[PDB]
Amino acid sequence: LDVKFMADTKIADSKRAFELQKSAFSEEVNIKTAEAQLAYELQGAREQQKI
Amino acid sequence: YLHSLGKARTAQVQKDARIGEAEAKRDAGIREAKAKQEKVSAQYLSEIEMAK
């Protein structure tokens, strides 16, 4: 069991690095996703002006 | 009367058996655990590059 708990800690430290980086990357994806969705209105409203 | 004299050995060999079993299972768990470390660690380390 002593070796077991130590093994579980190293698995957790590996988990930690991964989930942390997922979050960092998801922020970037989420940010540019919103822009991609709403750009049609940013341009659409701007074009209604001339129309 | 007669069955008594040999119970000492039942008990002795039971130690020996119990100690062999436990030492062995101990090493098994030790190795399996150490095996689990690199296996799961390398999986996450590789999956990080897949995410990147």
Torsion, Cα B30 B32 B36 B38, to 10 degrees, reads 70
Torsion, Cα A26 A31 A33 A35, to 10 degrees, reads -170
SS3 content of chain B, % helix, strand, coil (to 5): 85, 0, 15
Interface membership of A16 toward B (CB under 8 Å) = no
**Among A14, A8, A21, residue whose Cα is nearest residue B44:** A14
Q: How far apart, in whole angstroms, are the C-alpha atoms of residue A8 and residue A22?
A: 21
**Among B27, B49, B45, B25, residue whose Cα is nearest residue B37:** B45
Find the closest chain B residue to A19 by CA distance: B48
Chain A: closest CA distance from residue B20 (Å): 18
| Cβ contacts of B30 on chain A, cutoff 8 Å | 3
Experimentally, the structure was elucidated by cryo-EM
How far from A22 is each of A9, A31, B40, B49, CA to CA, in Å? Answer: 20, 14, 17, 11
